[PDB]
């Protein structure tokens, strides 16, 4: 159960890192 939690946490953080890049890209796009 400790192993399953560490796996889930790292998975969510990797997912959040992907969306952070996506959000920064979209913010940059809002420019002209």
């Amino acid at each position: 159960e400790i192993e399953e939690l560490e796996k889930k946490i790292e998975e969510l953080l990797k997912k959040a890192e992907e969306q952070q890049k996506k959000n920064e890209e979209e913010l940059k796009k809002l420019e002209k």
Partner: protein, 44 residues
């Protein structure tokens, strides 16, 4: 608005991801709390 809808969507999904990460960490923290208490009972 109509522009930043895509960014707003990404931010909201980002908040869900952070929230779910924090909640998972809380379950882990809860486990480490009991692990410490069990050791305290065996040593303290």
């Amino acid at each position: 608005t109509v522009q930043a809808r895509q960014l707003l969507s990404g931010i909201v999904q980002q908040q869900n991801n952070l929230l779910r990460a924090i909640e998972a960490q809380q379950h882990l923290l809860q486990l480490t709390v009991w692990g410490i208490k069990q050791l305290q009972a065996r040593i303290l």
